Every structure is written in structure tokens, then in C-alpha cells.
Amino acid sequence: GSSGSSGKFDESALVPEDQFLAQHPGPATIRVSKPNENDGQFMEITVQSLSENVGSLKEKIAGEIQIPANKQKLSGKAGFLKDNMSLAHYNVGAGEILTLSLRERSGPSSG
């Protein structure tokens, strides 16, 4: 049993995927940076639930950029997010931002 509020992000006291999940019942808008950009503008990819697997997300964007989850790589605060892992586990929800990197920059494809 436990309960309380939070403010600053602590490394030696991160919220468990179990708590992070409930903490946010509704959908959490996950912001993702553009492939080979930053100053430009980010996209808006929300997920009904956080429990979802990082992979399921890569698919959503994979449509806009037209790139297979395999090609594009997702990186999170902690590091390269694994499709097998979930979002809540990494503490991603209405606050955390993920980055999208393109596998081997094309060249003739500018913004």
C-alpha cells in the first residue's frame, strides 16, 4: 500500500510500468520528432493506452514517413526503445518525448 504526489523526475525511484499505467487512464499524446530534423516541427501520435508496445507505435508513424519500424529507430530518454518493451515502463506519458532516427540518411530527400 502507498500513495502520494510527484514533481521532479528521480532516477533512483522511477514509477513502475504498473503504476505509470493507472496513473494515466485516458490516452496520452506522445510527441515524436521528425526524421533528420528538430527545429522544424514534431508530429502528434497519441495512444489509447500506454501499456502498448513501443513497436505498435513505430507503426503509426511508419505510415506518415512511409518507413518500416525495422528501418526507422526510436530512441527514448533512457535509450533506444525496444518494441518488446512498453511505454509506461520507460515512464512515457503526457510529458516524455521520443526521437525518431532514419537508418542511413538518404541524401536527395530533404525537408
Coordinates of C-alpha atoms in Angstrom, one line a residue:
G1 CA 0.0 0.0 0.0
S2 CA 1.1 3.5 -0.8
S3 CA 0.1 6.9 -2.2
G4 CA 1.4 10.4 -2.9
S5 CA 2.2 13.1 -5.4
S6 CA 5.3 13.7 -7.5
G7 CA 7.1 16.6 -9.3
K8 CA 10.7 16.1 -10.3
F9 CA 12.0 13.1 -12.2
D10 CA 14.0 10.8 -10.0
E11 CA 16.3 8.0 -11.3
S12 CA 16.5 6.0 -8.1
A13 CA 12.7 6.0 -7.7
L14 CA 11.1 5.7 -11.1
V15 CA 7.5 4.7 -11.4
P16 CA 6.8 1.1 -12.2
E17 CA 5.0 0.3 -15.5
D18 CA 2.2 -0.9 -13.3
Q19 CA 1.8 2.5 -11.6
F20 CA 2.6 4.6 -14.6
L21 CA -0.2 2.8 -16.4
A22 CA -3.0 3.5 -14.0
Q23 CA -1.6 7.0 -13.2
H24 CA -2.9 7.8 -16.6
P25 CA -6.2 6.1 -17.5
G26 CA -7.0 8.2 -20.5
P27 CA -5.0 8.4 -23.8
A28 CA -1.6 10.1 -23.6
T29 CA -0.4 12.2 -26.6
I30 CA 3.1 11.0 -27.5
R31 CA 5.2 13.6 -29.3
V32 CA 7.8 12.4 -31.8
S33 CA 10.5 14.4 -33.6
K34 CA 10.8 14.4 -37.4
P35 CA 13.4 12.2 -39.2
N36 CA 16.5 14.2 -39.6
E37 CA 15.0 17.4 -38.1
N38 CA 14.1 19.2 -34.8
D39 CA 13.6 23.0 -35.2
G40 CA 11.0 22.3 -37.9
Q41 CA 8.1 20.7 -36.1
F42 CA 7.1 17.4 -34.4
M43 CA 4.2 15.1 -35.0
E44 CA 1.2 14.1 -32.9
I45 CA 0.8 10.4 -32.2
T46 CA -1.5 9.5 -29.3
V47 CA -2.1 6.0 -27.9
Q48 CA -5.4 4.9 -26.3
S49 CA -3.2 3.2 -23.7
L50 CA 0.4 3.4 -22.6
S51 CA 0.7 -0.4 -22.0
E52 CA 1.0 -0.6 -25.8
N53 CA 4.3 -1.9 -27.1
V54 CA 6.8 0.6 -28.4
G55 CA 6.5 -1.4 -31.6
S56 CA 2.8 -0.7 -32.2
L57 CA 3.7 3.0 -32.1
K58 CA 6.5 2.7 -34.7
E59 CA 3.7 1.6 -37.0
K60 CA 1.6 4.7 -36.5
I61 CA 4.4 6.9 -37.7
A62 CA 5.7 4.4 -40.2
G63 CA 2.7 5.4 -42.2
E64 CA 3.5 9.2 -42.4
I65 CA 7.2 8.7 -43.1
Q66 CA 6.4 5.6 -45.1
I67 CA 9.1 3.7 -43.3
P68 CA 9.1 0.2 -41.7
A69 CA 9.5 0.0 -38.0
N70 CA 12.6 -2.0 -38.8
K71 CA 14.2 0.8 -40.8
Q72 CA 13.4 3.7 -38.6
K73 CA 14.7 3.5 -35.0
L74 CA 13.1 5.0 -31.9
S75 CA 15.2 6.5 -29.1
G76 CA 14.0 7.4 -25.6
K77 CA 15.4 9.4 -22.7
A78 CA 16.8 6.1 -21.4
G79 CA 17.9 5.0 -24.9
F80 CA 17.0 3.0 -28.0
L81 CA 13.4 1.9 -27.1
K82 CA 12.7 -1.8 -27.6
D83 CA 9.5 -2.9 -29.4
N84 CA 9.2 -5.7 -26.8
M85 CA 9.2 -3.1 -24.0
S86 CA 6.2 -0.9 -23.2
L87 CA 5.9 2.9 -22.9
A88 CA 4.8 3.0 -19.2
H89 CA 7.8 1.1 -18.2
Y90 CA 10.1 3.8 -19.7
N91 CA 7.8 6.3 -18.0
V92 CA 6.5 7.8 -21.2
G93 CA 3.2 9.6 -21.0
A94 CA 2.0 13.2 -21.4
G95 CA 5.4 14.6 -20.7
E96 CA 8.2 12.4 -22.2
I97 CA 9.3 13.0 -25.8
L98 CA 10.7 10.3 -28.1
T99 CA 13.1 10.9 -31.1
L100 CA 13.0 9.2 -34.5
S101 CA 16.2 8.5 -36.4
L102 CA 16.4 7.3 -40.0
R103 CA 18.5 4.3 -40.8
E104 CA 21.3 5.6 -43.1
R105 CA 20.4 9.1 -44.3
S106 CA 19.3 9.1 -47.9
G107 CA 20.5 12.4 -49.2
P108 CA 18.3 13.7 -52.0
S109 CA 15.4 13.6 -49.6
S110 CA 15.5 17.0 -47.8
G111 CA 12.8 18.6 -45.7

